[PDB]
């Protein structure tokens, strides 16, 4: 898609991810960052991605390699 | 050859420095080209007057940048130093390259 030759991911979250990868899934992790672009290693693991007032529960699945954390999170309430 | 390109706010001021380089040069030695004029740079600004709102009227400003170029084709090397240095160049900026 876009953003040139390879995306960015968050360092502090990556060390928590290696616990989630090695030990397997446990619970939604409460993360302030939305910034990371998902790649295969985050798949099958419960995380939670901030919307500016709460971490939104994303369980990661197969095609999410195409996506960032942030995309599933709603920052503007509606009727 | 050796040349002075000058820069000035006042046209009648860079005029006196390029007068002084001429009469210094033909005094101390010879061979000066006087002031080649060269086109004027004009820094034209416009800025908004009001502290708040009122876009409509603004005030325009200008800084006229007068250049001059003087060359000496002078080969009298040991009177070139006497031409050099001693001048204060009418209180405005000058640069002297070979």
């Amino acid at each position: 898609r876009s953003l040139k030759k390879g995306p960015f991911i968050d360092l502090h979250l990556l060390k928590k991810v290696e616990k989630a990868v090695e030990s397997g899934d446990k619970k939604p992790l409460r993360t302030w960052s939305r910034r990371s672009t998902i790649f295969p290693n985050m798949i099958g693991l419960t995380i939670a991605v901030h919307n500016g007032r709460q971490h939104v529960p994303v369980f990661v699945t197969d095609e999410m390699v195409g996506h960032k954390l942030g995309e599933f999170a709603p920052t503007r309430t509606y009727r | 050859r050796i040349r002075i390109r000058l820069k000035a706010f006042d046209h009648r001021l860079i005029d006196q420095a390029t007068a002084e380089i001429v009469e210094t040069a033909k005094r101390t030695g010879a061979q000066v080209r006087g002031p080649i004029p060269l086109p004027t740079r004009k820094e034209r600004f416009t800025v908004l007057i009001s502290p708040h709102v009122n876009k409509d009227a603004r005030d325009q400003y200008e800084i006229r940048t007068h250049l001059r170029l003087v060359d000496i084709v002078e080969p009298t090397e040991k009177t070139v130093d006497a031409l050099m240095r001693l001048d204060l160049a009418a209180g405005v900026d000058v640069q002297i390259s070979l």
Partner: protein, 127 residues
Amino acid sequence: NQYYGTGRRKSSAARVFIKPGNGKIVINQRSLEQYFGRETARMVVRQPLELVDMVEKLDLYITVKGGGISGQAGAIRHGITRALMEYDESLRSELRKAGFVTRDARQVERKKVGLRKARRRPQFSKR
């Protein structure tokens, strides 16, 4: 010998020279006709070689820069009428009646703050 005439219109510098002869029209060392002179100032610049005399009595050398079509023409036009003087400038007196001894002074008016162009004013809600 040579008869010189300068002229300007709209910041276009021209340099006209004239001597006797069955002249073709020479502009920047090419013909004006090979500069599309069917269209480019087509009879416009050959104004002194219209009213007071015919074309084929003077050789002519012209060098022009700046403007577009009408921009290029008037500098050459006012240089060529002034250069028309093989035996004196007596024909300027007849060209005075025509008006081609006087170049058109006019230039573009600047942009100023609060106008869309130069006299064009914006529209504004109610009144």
